Amino acid sequence: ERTFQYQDSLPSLPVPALEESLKKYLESVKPFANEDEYKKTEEIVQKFQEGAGKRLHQKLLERARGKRNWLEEWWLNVAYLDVRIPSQLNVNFVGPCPHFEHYWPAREGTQLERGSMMLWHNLNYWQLLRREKLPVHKSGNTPLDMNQFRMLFSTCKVPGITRDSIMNYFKTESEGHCPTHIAVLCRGRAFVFDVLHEGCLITPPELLRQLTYIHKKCSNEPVGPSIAALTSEERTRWAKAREYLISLDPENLTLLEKIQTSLFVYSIEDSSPHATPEEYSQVFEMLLGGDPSVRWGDKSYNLISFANGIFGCCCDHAPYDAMVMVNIAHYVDERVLETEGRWKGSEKVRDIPLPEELVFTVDEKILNDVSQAKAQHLKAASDLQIAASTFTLHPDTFIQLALQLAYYRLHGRPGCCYETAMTRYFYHGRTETVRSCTVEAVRWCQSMQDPSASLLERQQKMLEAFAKHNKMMKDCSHGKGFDRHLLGLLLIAKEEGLPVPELFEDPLFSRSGGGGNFVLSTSLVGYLRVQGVVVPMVHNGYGFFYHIRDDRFVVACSSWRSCPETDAEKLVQMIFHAFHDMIQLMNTAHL
């Protein structure tokens, strides 16, 4: 069995029934509306269904007739490539490598040693992919889309004046040649070397020399030009700085392409985030912040190495979703466990070429842009607050409802929530929106805060909330959600220069969460001991992510300090109390 052999058999992403979608939409706005607003919205929705919507839906169906996935391109453009704000900090997702829970605790001086092995395992995974030996993901006996795995290596974003683009150079052995070099960023400089020698992958010892030549080459000297820092800028500025940097030297384009085509970017930091099984929130902060001088935000996969031998990943969210990064990070974690975090093979170091530096041609302007880029990224990042902890009836649904109660208790109002739902059952299926803030969830929350409420009432309502969410999560993953659907109708109109339907201008549309207005941006990152996070979706919002182990729940919450009403720390505390309260309500209501 080969990794991508089921791609041609995957079913097309479906288009829900118009009426079904609108009904789910109408139901979702209820928690945020009174009689009048609701009736107003209901009227708007009915006219839509009968008129414009029916026609835009018909056009959406025609689009699906010619595309195995009608959403693919639109989603990439409207959710990522078209956005102009700084993506590195505001869209990229990060995740700490959990190797410090066992064999690789935080410890100065282990940076180059562990790093050599980090590269070795990562590269073995790449080889696994290139040979299509990576196991096909399956739900029962149903194969899942594996296309996002093509975006892990040799993939990089390229800025545009109005729209960025994605460059995917990866290729399987069957498809042809694939870049075989990695790019290392250090002290504002960029080096690259071939990971192959005489046909086979270079061993850790050899990988150690390569990182040694680079580390020294710029360790006793001040930082370099830091062209990389420009990747953390507003998308248009970066696009302008790039065109310029190139106009100075036609060769600069060649260096940029070297970085873009590399299997991935390895960043060597000098900072040391406090990383321990108890406190690791700091790892998230330096992962999303850090020193822009050695980060290539446009890279789909940027492995980060700190001084205390701690590791983390920062990825461009545009080409793929977090599950691919979670998979390799976990694969490596397992490799570390089996080898007790050590290389026990040959110590020989064959005579392989030394890392070649990429010396960009710059002037006074570029250096100013570089200086500005660092300042804006660092300034913006300092406003970020991260709270990470471990807590020791589907687990995901349990956490989602607990978050609803927690937010409800902390802010005294229902929090419109976005929960990611994977739709990989379909060709190139990525995600769908699950709206956790349902009528059921709210009624349950109220009862939880209702002194006169009985235990039987509370559990009965909590259960109805679970049933509603489970169903919702199931339907959404099966392509029966409505968020992407409504987006498609809107995009059908826009693409033809037709006016924006009144449906989207409705105050309730955005109050319920539409238009990227969810106060709670969330997602389960899996069951593979790896955790990640991103910044909130709105200034007065929260970012809440988590992963589930058979013995604990691990969460990571983000919030903006500049916003006085939110506090990531207190929310995490609140959800833990919510977990507890929900526990008692289940054990007590045992009879």
Cβ at position 132, least distance to ligand 152 in Å: 26
Exactly one of 534, 568, 571, 574 binds ligand 152 (CB under 6 A); that residue is 534
546 near ligand 152 (CB under 6 A): no
Q: Which of 302, 304, 254, 261 is nearest to 154 (CA)?
A: 261
CA dist list (Å): 335 to 96, 120, 209, 327, 463 = 16, 10, 21, 12, 41
> Is-contact 28 483, C-beta < 8 A?
no
Cβ at position 317, least distance to ligand 152 in Å: 7
Specify the residue for token string 């990988």: 207
Chain positions 505 to 524 lying near ligand 152, rule: CB under 6 A, are: 521-523
Q: Which amino acid is at 133?
A: K
Kindly tell me which of 3 and 521 has the beta carbon lying closer to ligand 152.
521
Chain positions 428 to 457 lying near ligand 152, rule: CB under 6 A, are: 431
Instruction: Give the sign of the dihedral formed by CA 274, CA 275, CA 277, CA 280.
Output: positive
Query: What residues does 421 pair with on adjacent strands?
Result: 432
Annotated binding site for CoA: 393-396
Kindly tell me which of 3 and 431 has the beta carbon lying closer to ligand 152.
431
Distance from C-alpha of 311 to C-alpha of 115, rounded to nearest angstrom: 8
Cβ at position 64, least distance to ligand 152 in Å: 19
Exactly one of 48, 238, 301, 418 binds ligand 152 (CB under 6 A); that residue is 418
88 near ligand 152 (CB under 6 A): no
Cβ at position 385, least distance to ligand 152 in Å: 17
Kindly tell me which of 241 and 534 has the beta carbon lying closer to ligand 152.
534
Q: How many CA atoms lie within 13 A of 483 on its CB side?
A: 29
Please indicate whether residue 478 is annotated as part of the active site. no
Annotated binding site for (R)-carnitine: 418, 420, 431
Exactly one of 491, 537, 555, 574 binds ligand 152 (CB under 6 A); that residue is 537
H or E element: which one contains 241? helix 235-248
420 near ligand 152 (CB under 6 A): yes
- Sequence-distant (6+) residues with CB within 8 A of 487 are 71, 74, 75, 78
Cβ at position 546, least distance to ligand 152 in Å: 12
Q: What DSSP string runs through 474-514?
A: HHHHTT--SHHHHHHHHHHHHHTTPPPPHHHHSHHHHHTTT
Kindly tell me which of 150 and 242 has the beta carbon lying closer to ligand 152.
150
Cβ at position 537, least distance to ligand 152 in Å: 6
558 near ligand 152 (CB under 6 A): no
> Is-contact 525 93, C-beta < 8 A?
no
Kindly tell me which of 418 and 426 has the beta carbon lying closer to ligand 152.
418
Cβ at position 577, least distance to ligand 152 in Å: 24
Q: Starting from the edge strand earliest in sequence, which strands make up the sheet with 552-560, in order?
A: 384-391, 552-560, 542-549, 520-524, 417-422, 431-435
Dihedral of CA atoms 88, 89, 95, 101 in degrees, nearest 10, equals 130
Choice among 121, 317, 428, 485 that is catalytic: 317
316 near ligand 152 (CB under 6 A): no
CA dist list (Å): 467 to 393, 398, 512, 583 = 9, 11, 21, 17
Kindly tell me which of 275 and 487 has the beta carbon lying closer to ligand 152.
487
> Is-contact 80 71, C-beta < 8 A?
no
321 near ligand 152 (CB under 6 A): yes
Residues in the chain: 591
Chain positions 41 to 70 lying near ligand 152, rule: CB under 6 A, are: none
Annotated binding site: 393-396, 418, 420, 431
Kindly tell me which of 32 and 75 has the beta carbon lying closer to ligand 152.
75
- Interaction site with ligand 152 (CB under 6 A): 321, 418, 420, 431, 521-523, 534, 537
Q: Give the residue numbers annotated as catalytic, written as ranges.
A: 317
